[PDB]
């Protein structure tokens, strides 16, 4: 059956609901209260073929920060839940995607060990109304609850929207690869330490 | 039938036996007299899905060097034997794998022309009892007898075990890709110069 | 009895009311017209255990500046009033608090001599709608009316919200320490010059 | 009652058992297969007043790495279990400890968000038989499973044993502080977002 | 009973008597023949809550040096005597104190091993009639006879009196902390090597 | 009569016994559990003409560190005991000794004030199994308990064994000089401050 993870979490800052299907058809259904983040989550669905359902509300009058963080945390947990014991999966993903002049490499390992390597240099402070510092925080928080090893490398880029969107496209494709079935490994856990 | 290469070689320094199945199921069976190298050869099996059988003894009281070298030479020859005329294969492999903070890119071409490009900077001299200079030598010797074009690029890393292990994981996945069947090329040799 | 200081002040720019209990239970009740500042004043209450009541209105259509300043001035005066002759208190506070990658050291002396040492480098201009230059001004104004010696040192940090919030947490804990009873000094003024 | 966390975990690499009492009397009972790490865990007990019980076996013929990592992971989980919802605790710890010429600052926040800031520069590769790269890895792994924000800063030091031991002493004292009861906060969760 | 240490020493250069109560009430009673040093010893009493009795005479027509040194040596011995086997004490102290623009960190360990780390840069040669080189010598000599590990770090400062006085305040508070009872350790020696 | 100092000390880390004759005939009798240190202590005897008896056991499975330190501490105390009031001695020693390309200057003053000046740069981490950081620690600890002013200056050298051994030879000769009778001073204490 399809691998589906669901998470609901609320604090005094935010209220978040996430549902992700690893074996999806790219159904895009994200409403975070942060329009730019919604557009990015749509790439995750369109290019990763995940079904992505997100609802969030929160204290955006203070900052988009808490909302952004809590969405990311919940997505990471949903990924973790959907994955289980990771039997039969590729485990590793590696993809470099452009968007015009931008070029972003993502490599990830569904390892159970959280790590973010990140070197983006986004040259403007706001893309629309979205604080561009929140991109790093989105990935960091997602890593922390998913237990993913994730490296994001900026190889080229100038336009902030292009840089960020190329990142989400590359991430989506790398994550799709990692989560997909390995046709040769016959349902074994992809690790020497099992 | 499965592509299997077997090599036995002895000198006054070492005695080595290798058997590799390119079309394996990740059977790990390596005993070199060098425990760290055994752990690395296990990644080769687990992530490359090669069946890897290695037995070696040698003059480890002098150095792990001769053993390490002769194991690598024999593995390269076994790969060469298993491959044959390389009909119908992908030929090229390209994969970047992390292990936590380490990130290693491997690109290879089963070209018949030996070349190693290598830029690892391993910041400690011994990982366990294993001399970290021997990593480069392992790949160089393997290249020399297999007739492989191999590039290994350190993109990130600090922990020596992480750097080396990520290298073996990336190599395993790139080699798996290169050795696998190309579903479109209908048993032709993947070269313009045939 | 509990040490409570109350201040009301109005100008043509702003209208401010503050009530602070040094011996509080962390009651958070701040409405400044500046949502980010409200969130920071909540840390002051939650981590310092002060009861913090603030109401402010003002010329935010011009700038948050005058409001921010006048709130800070009034808080400083309220602290001064609540403290009195400082009999029996610790006087000095010293605490370093993180928020994720940010790490902020605050040291203060309830000396009667105003001084601010401040080296924060906040890498974005707006956190939500809040002008990040106003952080320094908040502490400067508070120091000026409280007669506090205050040092704020950025030891690490990248995310602007993390940097600022860690500052308020560290400040809250240092101020709590300084204002609390010294169990050994038997109600004496903590100074050699009395 | 005393806050006690217990963890047993085994892999093909290691076998680990940990029991930690947050409200201990400094009972030191650590046997990891890594003598230097045992000595460090004794400081954790002696200076933190934790009761620390650790048993580990593993593939030390390969490297101390896997053992070191798996001990740290299990300690982090044990801390997490012992802490619960963190009601009534100080939450934050801050301590700088010397050992002769070495001087190490540790600041931590029991936040639920893993982060390690670390800048130690240990000038030798082996302290006894212990690979000094493994110090960073111990703290990283502990952070990852405990969900702790941890900063370790080398302020002075030359002797590798002094640097590492001062780190464990400072960490022990900061962790003791963070885990202890806050006498004023009346069993409330020490956070504004509850 | 109160922990009191007394020392009398005379040479052809100086004549010194010291009495220190670790469990004091901040009784200040210092007359060294060096007025600035008397003022500093008063901070030690006022902020450390030590009872400090010092009488010294000596060859101040030559230099304040011998007097300064012999006072410090005798204070260190008095501390050592008052401390004994150090049963049940905190052992470690850590405090950073300002005086206006000056900010001085002191960390110390009552270890039995003398060490001074010191980086003050006092920008004038005489504060009143007191040679500012003698500050370092005071702490060095005190360390040498007390068997204390002591680190003094200048974090900020310009005015020489402020720098020196902040040092004595920070030292007093760190020493108070280190010498005080640890409420949890039940009269045990605070060391793993007992 | 011959000036003989004897010290026995034990901790949970080590057990040490030392006997030194200042007026010896170079009797070498050192067994520390650290073979390289034994060889160095033999130079002390052979070139200083001290009779040197040392027995030590300790936690060398952790590190040679604690043993090395505790031997040095005990030697320093033994020197102090053997010396007494230092009547009639040279007090000062000054010698520069080579060992092949290495050249080491030692100057010392039996002053009653501990100080180590040390600038050795030993270019390898292990001489045999001996951690070369422990050389500095040996001299520091010896100074701390003997109350000696000691300067060690590397004037030339490349081979680590040569550097360290030349240091012990120079030290032995300087210490011999300092401890020997001054034929002119007629049993007076060699100080202006008696
Ligand atoms: O968990 P896996 O499958 O990546 C295998 C481990 O040996 C990895 N590793 C992590 N640190 C040192 N080695
Ligand atoms: O052998 P192949 O299939 O890579 C084809 C050759 O033309 C490659 N080549 C090597 N040197 C110059 N060209
Ligand atoms: O006011 P206090 O208690 O800090 C004591 C003063 O001597 C401080 N001081 C200020 N400038 C020079 N000394
Ligand atoms: O979780 P807590 O108690 O530290 C309160 C949060 O507002 C912290 N925070 C984290 N990112 C931005 N703010
Ligand atoms: O004496 P303590 O209590 O600090 C414990 C010792 O292990 C310290 N140490 C000193 N050098 C190497 N380790
Ligand atoms: O003890 P002695 O014999 O070296 C004589 C002293 O005057 C030395 N001294 C130390 N500090 C300033 N002078
Ligand atoms: Cl690249
Ligand atoms: Cl600092
Ligand atoms: Mn955050
Ligand atoms: Mn777009
Ligand atoms: Mn070779
Ligand atoms: Mn491994
Ligand atoms: Mn203004
Ligand atoms: Mn916040
Ligand atoms: Mn690891
Ligand atoms: Mn130790
Ligand atoms: Mn002097
Ligand atoms: Mn003053
Ligand atoms: Mn030591
Ligand atoms: Mn020799």
Numbering used by the authors:
A (entry chain A), B (entry chain A), C (entry chain A), D (entry chain A), E (entry chain A), F (entry chain A): 9 to 202
Q: How does the study describe this entry?
A:
The program of herbicide development described herein aims to identify inhibitors of imidazoleglycerolphosphate‐dehydratase (IGPD; EC 4.2.1.19), an enzyme of histidine biosynthesis in plants and microorganisms. This enzyme catalyzes the manganese(II)‐dependent dehydration of (2R,3S)‐2,3‐dihydroxy‐3‐(1H‐imidazol‐5‐yl)propyl dihydrogen phosphate (2R,3S‐IGP) to 3‐(1H‐Imidazol‐4‐yl)‐2‐oxopropyl dihydrogen phosphate (IAP).4 IGPD shows strict enantioselectivity for its substrate, with the other three diastereoisomers of IGP acting as competitive inhibitors of the enzyme, thus indicating that the active site shows some flexibility to accommodate inverted chiral centers. Previous studies have shown that IGPD is inhibited by triazolylphosphonates, whose potency is based on mimicking key reaction intermediates. In this paper we describe work on the lead compound, 2‐hydroxy‐3‐(1,2,4‐triazol‐1‐yl) propylphosphonate (C348) and present a series of structures of IGPD, from Arabidopsis thaliana, complexed with a synthetic racemate of C348 and with the enantiopure compounds.
In this study, weak electron density was observed adjacent to the chiral center of the lead compound in a 1.85 Å resolution structure of our target enzyme in complex with a racemate. However, as with the electron density for C348 in the 1.85 Å structure, the density at 1.1 Å resolution was also weak around C3. Nevertheless, a small peak could be observed in the map around C3 when contoured at 1 σ, the position of which was consistent with the binding of the (S)‐C348. Refinement of this structure using tight geometric restraints revealed further difference features, indicating a second position for the inhibitor, which, from the geometry, could only be interpreted as resulting from the binding of the (R)‐C348. This finding indicated that in the crystal, the active sites of some of the enzyme molecules were occupied by (S)‐C348 and others were occupied by (R)‐C348. Subsequent refinement of this structure with occupancies of 0.6 and 0.4 for the (S)‐ and (R)‐C348, respectively, produced a model which fully explained the electron density, thus indicating that both enantiomers of C348 were bound to an essentially invariant enzyme structure. The two enantiomers thus trace an inverted path between the metal binding site and the phosphonate binding site, whereby they are related by mirror‐image packing. Both enantiomers retain low‐energy conformations with approximately staggered torsion angles, with the largest deviation in the atomic position of equivalent atoms occurring at C3 of the backbone, thus explaining the weak density at this position observed in the complexes of IGPD2 with the racemate. By extending the resolution and chirally resolving the two enantiomers we confirmed that the areas of weakness arose from the mirror‐image packing of the two enantiomers of the inhibitor in the active site, an observation not without precedence.
